[PDB]
Amino acid sequence: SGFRKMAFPSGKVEGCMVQVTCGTTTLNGLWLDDVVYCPRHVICTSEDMLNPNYEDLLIRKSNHNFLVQAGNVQLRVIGHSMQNCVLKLKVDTANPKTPKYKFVRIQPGQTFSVLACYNGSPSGVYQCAMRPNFTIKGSFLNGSCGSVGFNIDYDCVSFCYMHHMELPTGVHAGTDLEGNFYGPFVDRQTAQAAGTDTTITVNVLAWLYAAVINGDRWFLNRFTTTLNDFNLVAMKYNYEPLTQDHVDILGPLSAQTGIAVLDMCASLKELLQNGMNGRTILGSALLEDEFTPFDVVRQCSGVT
């Protein structure tokens, strides 16, 4: 019993983190097989980041300008290319700790673990969600760029996020491992405002189910609702619309608890309308939206 914001074990990713230095900039890279992936803004001086022309800046760079260190051992760079907003540094040595891996581009509302790193060294691990506005609310200081977000399926690491920047509001933006930003953000030191940070409704419901499984039941009410009625309330509270795809995904939690998805919607409706009246659910005073239905099943079933 008990329910925690739980990150994937980080060891498989720890074995992939290296330091990349270009001129006076040091950040993190991800060493998989004989390629090191890092943010392309590693090549940029302060003045460059006003309006950086990455193709033009890279013309001035050679293989030997990219200093790649794995622990205290230097890797030999034998090639480099830009793919969208990431650099791929070909090194002469395959990472011997390379896990089975995939590169995945996640959808908003999907959760993943971040291994926060500085100088290619891990400092900690936490669980994130891709916000509906394609920001993440991370914990990143200078030097943390190139830190990655991932999911693990038994022995296969799915890399979904590489950290590139903090917005002036202190929320975080980055790319998939093909170098494509989540959301409309660009790797430039310019005013970039995030859109509405809405609540991930399907995740809230999953977490309400987690609460019931763990014996927190005070919020279960006598009511039901419809998808359309619930959605009227959801929009009023800056909650994402709930679709039948979301209802389908909640089916196993519905089955285990015997609480119909639309009944749980009516419980969530009353919580939105009434607030929590100073009560807590799984030790939270707000409705938690950074657990997916898959996260709840996994944690509640004990998948390794």
Ligand X SMILES: OC1CCN(Cc2ccsc2)CC1
Residue 78 is inside which H or E element, if any? strand 77-83
Which one of its own copies, ligand X, none interacts with residue 284, CB within 5 to 8 A by kind?
its own copies
Which one of ligand X, its own copies, none interacts with residue 165, CB within 5 to 8 A by kind?
ligand X
Strand partners, 19: 28, 69
Interface of this chain with ligand X, residues 136 to 165, rule: CB under 6 A: 164-165
HSE of 71, CA atoms in CB hemisphere, 13 A? 5
**Could you tell me the two tokens for 123?**
């400092």
User: By the 8 A CB rule, do 146 and 73 touch?
Assistant: no
Rg (the chain; Cα; Å): 21
Amino acid at 117: C
- In this structure, the dihedral spanned by the alpha carbons of residues 174, 178, 182 and 188, taken in order and rounded to 10 degrees, is 50
Task: By CB under 8 A, tell whether 144 contacts its own copies.
Answer: yes
Q: Is 41 a catalytic residue?
A: yes
The secondary structure of 232-258 as a DSSP string is: HHHHHTTBPPP-HHHHHHHHHHHHHHT
CA distance 166 to 172: 5
Which one of its own copies, ligand X, none interacts with residue 25, CB within 5 to 8 A by kind?
ligand X
Task: By CB under 6 A, tell whether 196 contacts ligand X.
Answer: no
Q: Which stretch binds its own copies (CB under 8 A): 185-193, 231-239, 249-257, 293-301?
A: 293-301
Q: Which residue has the tokens 């200093």?
A: 67
Task: By CB under 8 A, tell whether 3 contacts its own copies.
Answer: yes
Question: Within 10 A of 49 (CB to CB), how many other CB atoms are there?
Answer: 14
Q: Which stretch binds ligand X (CB under 6 A): 38-46, 215-223, 230-238, 296-304?
A: 38-46
CA distance 164 to 181: 9
Closer residue to its own copies in complex, CB, 8/239: 8
Task: By CB under 6 A, tell whether 189 contacts ligand X.
Answer: yes
Which one of its own copies, ligand X, none interacts with residue 5, CB within 5 to 8 A by kind?
its own copies
Closer residue to its own copies in complex, CB, 54/126: 126
Question: Within 10 A of 224 (CB to CB), how many other CB atoms are there?
Answer: 16
Task: By CB under 8 A, tell whether 4 contacts its own copies.
Answer: yes
Taking the complex as a whole, the smallest distance from the CB of residue 176 to its own copies amounts, in Å, to: 20
CA distance 85 to 77: 19
Among 22, 38, 41, 246, the active-site one is 41
The site for ligand X, by CB under 6 A, has a size of: 10
Q: Is 117 a catalytic residue?
A: no
User: By the 8 A CB rule, do 183 and 170 touch?
Assistant: no
Which one of ligand X, its own copies, none interacts with residue 187, CB within 5 to 8 A by kind?
ligand X
Taking the complex as a whole, the smallest distance from the CB of residue 302 to its own copies amounts, in Å, to: 4
- Binding pattern to its own copies, positions 10-49, x when CB under 8 A? xxx-xx----------------------------------
DSSP state, residue 284? B
Burial of 240 (0-12, 13-18, 19+ CB in 10 A): buried
Q: Select from 5, 15, 21, 49 the one that contacts ligand X (CB under 6 A).
A: 49
Among 44, 145, 160, 265, the active-site one is 145
Interface of this chain with its own copies, residues 201 to 230, rule: CB under 8 A: 214-215
Taking the complex as a whole, the smallest distance from the CB of residue 145 to ligand X amounts, in Å, to: 7
> Applying CB under 6 A, which residues contact ligand X?
25, 41, 44, 46, 49, 164-165, 187-189
Active site residues: 41, 145
